[model samples]
Target: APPIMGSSVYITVELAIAVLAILGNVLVCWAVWLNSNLQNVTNYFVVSLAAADILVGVLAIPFAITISTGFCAACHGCLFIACFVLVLAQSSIFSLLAIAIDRYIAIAIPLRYNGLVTGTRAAGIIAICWVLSFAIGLTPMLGWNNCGQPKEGKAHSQGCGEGQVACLFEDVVPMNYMVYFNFFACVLVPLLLMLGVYLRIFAAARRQLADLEDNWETLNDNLKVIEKADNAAQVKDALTKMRAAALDAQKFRHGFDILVGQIDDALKLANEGKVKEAQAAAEQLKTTRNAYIQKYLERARSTLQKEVHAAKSAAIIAGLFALCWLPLHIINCFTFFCPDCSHAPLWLMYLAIVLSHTNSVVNPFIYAYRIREFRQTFRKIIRS
Candidate 1:
């Protein structure tokens, strides 16, 4: 196939993707740098990943265009370009692996992660990844060449030739060794390691989720116990109050009963011609009845007030959970499906990507919200 110098639609798409990759990675780097709160030891790996992605955007994609255009067949530029892209891509891969390891540690043993994965140690790991990537990239230059024309007298026109032959080199390492070496070192080993780490990460996460579910169940059970105890206590309190109120009412009733008895006796006296004594007893009964009605109203009002206050406090906490965590949980559902971006509509895919990236940005805010030290530091940065 001839070199694709023309502005094809696919080329345009490639350009767009490349540009987005660059801008997105750059923004991530900038945001991390700007916010001290984002500067956890784990994030050092994230920063390195951003750097590698930026390199891919800047170097690999454009070089890909050059290769597609068949411009590299002129000199040994094709070989070097291939090596450069490989290094950049491998750097990204290794950085992602570092992130996986970091996440695994953070999830599996969070209490110890802070002590184990210090800033200096993380930096060292990143440095080692870069060093290994560079070493592999320089394999051909270091006389492990497999990218060139075949040696004379060994005339084979098969496999990589014109457009495809750009990467082939003169052999230094044994062919079998090179094949096995690239396969194991470059492809198989890292892949399996990443898969293993990610598997452990998912397991750890699931275990944590299970633990939280257990905690939630236990918490609910404890709450039920507390609820039952509280209800019992409230019933006992209500019974005690009612008994005290009844006792007070009984005391008033007892006095009233004696008054009635005296009134009856006075009335009997009036009927027998002692009218002054009967009139005095009637006045005493009228005064005591008003005092009894006032005391009954006071006890009922105090009991109703206590019930209302308890209900109001319980309602407030229930409201906050519904508002804060529920919506985020739904948002998480969509995040879980985001890897299927290719199957969705372009606009929908873009939206999902943006929404997912927003999570990354939002995480710092979540941290700030949870941690007083981070909150204060974030506020200080915003103010400054």
Candidate 2:
């Protein structure tokens, strides 16, 4: 088949971006792996993510571009692209899961997190992710949801040759499933799990800090009372100080109980599929719950800020997944139902596919920028 040039600069750019993304991600992985200091859990994830991005770029994009450019280089262009995309997408999703899981462990049980997130375990998880991803990816390829028919008046006369394929990648049911999967696996589950763990850890940290403060206050009061015991007035002052300390403990316990209740309520809402309820709960938490913590940890304002920052980061990624990928899926869905509808523009398909692939590049940066430890490692590499 003769090539149609310049009509699809968009496809060319998409391929270029994928190639560049693959190279850059490969470099990042190498940087992390070769450096002993970067052997931490976060960068370990960088390795997995980079590998996935590279796979998306190398295996998925080429076939996609072929289809986009009206050149059916292989006999089975649609089948293979569908499968390759499946593997790439699933790999990316699971890699995100790995990252979320690792972060949850790190923030939740900071003490034993290192032991739990070992290289061997990480490798095992990666293998499992790929195997599962591959199985899922290959599902559509194996005649389950095949697109593209044979082209007429061509050698072997395949559909993707002279004639364009009209299959829409985004169908209604598939869109719903994709969004729901993304919601549960990619967005809701990981987020809820993380929220639970973080809430617990934050509570524990706050209680621990409060205890230390109370103890210090008590010791200071006791010493003052001892110093003033030389007079009758001083003795009364000491008694008053003791009473105040007792009141403080009473107040702490009451607040602590309330905090536990909030955690329990949040967890319940999440498990019960009440995310809007959960978000409302989170907002209430931010106002009422955060107000309480703010009073105690006045100097550590940054802690709350970090929590807010993380939530925003996760939200942004989720939004991108929906915005960029959903349209393509919606468009592709028509292929199954309305084979007679006008074929989606090659550039539009090209744009969506490339934009979807662009996700691979965005995810790692999100990790590095969001996590302080990863940020430190990234900074150190740059400095060195």
Candidate 3:
């Protein structure tokens, strides 16, 4: 263990923050599940966010703390912690992105809220998030991952290379490439999509609120016409409004159902090795989704606009998560590629490890503070 100065303090701070985050997020999930009033399309996402956060804390943080205290070996404790840290980091980022898209749908097409944001659909999205995260996290580790496996005995240590030891998992190039790919796939793509979804949700909510006011105004104008006979025109208009709302919601449902079906078809095609066919089918699916969004589901009811905004808020939580991880990755790239800086100091290396693990501890806190229902529900679940 490289002395207790540089990283031990960072490790201690990270451990405290991670434990508190996990506890707080657990309470968020529990409160939502226990309280009936808080159960909604948005809370589905709260549960997902908490789950991802808890996984990281459970799987990675303890190992990290153990390593800092000098009781753990490099080959065993450090290896598992390193692998799991990457896994949970990617998972958390993807989960936040899922939450964002869910919210975008709820706000953009409130009429179809139930059809699109049902429990079954939410579960599928969450599953996809984990799958995508795992793909990014594990593939590189398995194929060409590199790491510094701690050595002992110093049989030929050459005096620790001026007081700093060096090790490698295999090679530098492949692993560095994998890390860069992960940054683009897991970080950049999610950030851009979340931003777009937030903008759409905000605009959709504003329009919905305006439409609600217009409907209320019309209702008030005819409030003094109670004693009238044959007010069939107003009655027909009211029925028409209700029918339109129902139809729009049904359209949104149809859109989501079709999208799900397209995804299933694409998977089947991919499984059959019809890559070209699957690609074409995916393109068509995209076109259909766009048409549905533009023609059928854009005009949403006002009742759930707030839920839309809330969901977007949940998605943007990934932004903070990305910040936590960004530093370690950038430094890792420099350490591997820059010839002049071929080696990182012991302290800097330990700090990189610390920062990467910090995300697992920070995510739950993001959800608890930003999403109120989730926080309350998490507490109730614990009490029960």
Candidate 4:
């Protein structure tokens, strides 16, 4: 209805998209394969996506060209192209879903993810995706063709042109059945599945955030209790020190009183001869006061340092968790829900397709950038 290509402009733009998909997928494969650090379960799924996208570029796009240029009618090339596109696109969709599940597991249950999703299991899953893709793609070719109409029989030969065409006629499934099948099986179900997974991942993240806050609060409470206990011990120690100092002062006071009485006696004795004992008590008072003051200051300094360290660790953990994952998930939610308008501009659809392929290119970058070892390895590759 939209004139297939709409014009020469659309045709050129379509060709560009095909080229971008090919180059982008090629780059993705190369980045993962060239770096040993990139070899893992997550990147394996990414590679699977790239492979499907490459097929779309190489096989499906060429078929699109045949239809747009009216070349497919003569050879029944449309059937092959349609099947290839369907399979590749569906496989890519499944790969993305797998990646999402992998990320959810990694973030939600990191301790167990490794054991649950091993290399062997991931490889087997990937194998199944391709197998399923092929089976779905071949359905129209096997029996569900257009020429057979509502019932299975020999295909109508109007366009076949006396055996000139390879397949006798264009093979197509019934439109209503195809529409329902493609809509539900290819689009609706996958979208719902991903959405459900995303919600679970979100709920898990929220629980983790809440748990982290609770843990931090608990840690702070423990620190506060420790501080209180330390303060009580310090107070008790200060009291003991003060009491000892007081006793010394009391002894000095009592001795001074005694000395004063003795001095009075000395005065009586001198006015009738006692100076040495008074000077010895004065010297003992100076030494006792200095020792207690030094011990109190040192104990106070050590207690202050421990409390500061506990506060810092809690703040750092909370900050890191919020900064890393929150924004990405928000963007993903917005992108997923905002693109289902029935009357979207043609250019917008083309843009969306181009942007979608970018994920295949950008994913490897995310893998490399997020990982320290891979980042360093990628840097080396770039420099060389």
Candidate 5:
């Protein structure tokens, strides 16, 4: 053991860790309590973890400090401290196991995760974890301890006098239990198992993502074909309009051509001295062409504007959809292919998420606002 004042410095470090842990975990519990949306199986497992961290802060740390400082009035006092510390610390490990198990199940089933993972089941696992850890914690109290072991005679000690002494932590918890059970059984093997679980999870996630990427690419090809077909339809419609307008203009020109032939015949008549007939034909030309020409030009102008409106609406719709949603999925795809590209600035990811979620709300508004009579339907929906 270190000197008394030296131990106080260590105590300061422990208290710092304890205080920060307690406050931080308190917020974790608080978040679960305040937000209904956050209340879920995985988050519930986090609550179990937060509970352990808080207990370790307030209960285990002080107990550990007391035992190590050898301020025990008796061996059992120190033994109880070690036991509580073990149980609390062990609870953290158990929660870690639960976390790994929950994540694996969530990823494994994917679509079935919500149907399977229940809070009551999570509570049950947490209860069992605490009980098993308590069993391990109290094993020394059940007589597998060094409390009565012979020691080298010195001014400091022999065996516990009359079954009690101001014992150290090692005096109560035996070396064999520490070496065989706590370190190997509880610590090392559990870590190795969690590591195995994580490795499988990463592999499964990567393979699944690759499958999705392939599917998306195939779907994109299908959409591209559909888009090509739509463009063909639009082009055909515009061509049909253009040909119809040309036919109408040609029909008007043919009628004017016959009228102009009458004008020429009237000029020929005037040349032969029939002035009254020529003047009558000229009056007929004035009545027919000017009004018809004005109306024809205006009709072509209106139709051209209508075509422009159609083209503009489609282009704007496509652009907005790309702006709102494409970046988020693009970012996800980038993350998938590029290692550590998630080192992207935190705000950028948040903005992408915000933009993505914004589209859900925005798209519905767009649908309701632009559909001519659907606003009445929305009005009725709101009234109801």
Candidate 6:
């Protein structure tokens, strides 16, 4: 068969990809080293990965170019080149795994991450990653390859002539190792493992988002409580003033009722021509009305401030109850009435339900933690 295209096209394109990869990786390394803010345990892997790319571009790519251009060399040199590159590429994957682990630690225990994943520790892991890369990548160099072996199923123009090894990838590297060890054991595990690590990281990240909402909402509640508590004295005094006003108004009304009743009785007595008895009753009215007023008026006035506080407390409780329950029903309406409409994800819908149900659980907490009578009673119950 005729060659479809000349080798020059491949050489040109490969050279460009190689050049760009070299420059890009070098830039990545340089930027990380130079930028103080970009320094972290995670970016340690970035530098390692960048170093791998640069090594591939500088060393591996040139050897690869020779094979692509059919440059003849001993199987030893070809095998060395292939093995070296496998190490480089594997180092890069190890770096990616390192990156995911670093991400997990940073998010999982962010405050302690710096203590746990120090710069020296990160450097040590990267060093180990490169060493481990060599362990597998140079496996072929330890005599697992097809160097100097017979041709497949027959003698061939392609098989090794004595002291004349072929400079081809398939000529030396064995399919068995490539399939069993490299593909099945080494390579695919990291790919799926990387995804699993990343998914776990995403779960952590999502929970962190929820954690912020929790802390931030506590901040909101804390501020509300602070202001409420700061004004609590003022409100108590205000309720006291209301009670004082009501007591004065109630005492004035009581005097009016007593005066009208006494005068009506006196008028009835005078109309019946019992002047002596009417006069005696009028004197008694002055005497007795104040005695009732002192007892009943004091009793009525004593209960007002406690009642006023409960009124203020109840309004806030109802307002919060509405605030907590509104979003779920709103989401439900979005799903029901807006049937043909583009809706939220099922996970988000479930989240709304979770949020909705949180109201019921938290309401008991509010009663126990926020209100005073409930607070004292629950404390006793908890203590018991």
Report per-prediction Cα RMSD to one decimal. Answer: 19.8, 13.7, 15.9, 17.5, 23.1, 26.1
User: 304-347 in candidate 1: lDDT tens per residue?
Assistant: 34323322222222223223323322333343445454333334
Provide the overall lDDT of each model, using Cα atoms, as 2-decimal numbers: 0.50, 0.57, 0.57, 0.51, 0.56, 0.57
- Alpha-carbon error at 180 in model 2, in Å? 9.1
Checking candidate 6 for backbone clashes, the offending pairs are none
Candidate 2 lDDT by residue in tens digits, 1-384: 233564357667777878777866765676676667667765565577678778777877775665454444443444555457767666666765566556556555656987888888888888888888877666545454423443344423444434344323431124334444433454445445545644564565556566656644663454454343444343334434543443454343554455445544544664565544543443343443355544554443355446446545644554555566666666655643467998787657667677777876675576567756556666666787
Q: How do the candidates rank by TM-score, highest first?
A: 3, 2, 4, 5, 6, 1
State the number of backbone clashes in model 5. Answer: 0
- lDDT of candidate 4? 0.51
Which pairs clash in model 1? 3-69, 146-169, 147-168, 147-169, 148-168, 148-169
TM of each candidate vs. truth: 0.49, 0.59, 0.62, 0.58, 0.55, 0.54
Stretches off by above 4 angstroms in model 5 are: 150-161, 218-384
lDDT of 2 at 71: 41
Error of 6 at 333 (Å): 52
Q: Pick the candidate with the highest TM-score.
A: 3
Which lDDT tens digits does candidate 6 get at residues 166-249? 566656777667656775466657756766766776676566455444533432343233234333333233223333333333
Give model 1's TM-score versus the native structure: 0.49
**Model 1, runs deviating above 4 Å:** 1-10, 72-76, 147-184, 209-384
Best by lDDT, which number?
Answer: 3
Candidate 5 lDDT over residue span 1-384, tens digit each? 436666676567666667766765665566567656557776676677668767767887677567655543466666788678667646656776666666777666756777788888888988898898899877888888866663334213533455455556555677667656765577557656766766666666566555444433432343233234333333233333333333434446654465446445545554555545544544554454455534544564464444333233322332343465456445544544566665455345445534532332232233245533334444544576
Q: What's the CA error at residue 271 for candidate 3, in Å?
A: 65
What local lDDT does model 6 show for residue 360?
Answer: 27
Candidate 1: Cα lDDT at 33: 81
lDDT of 5 at 124: 91
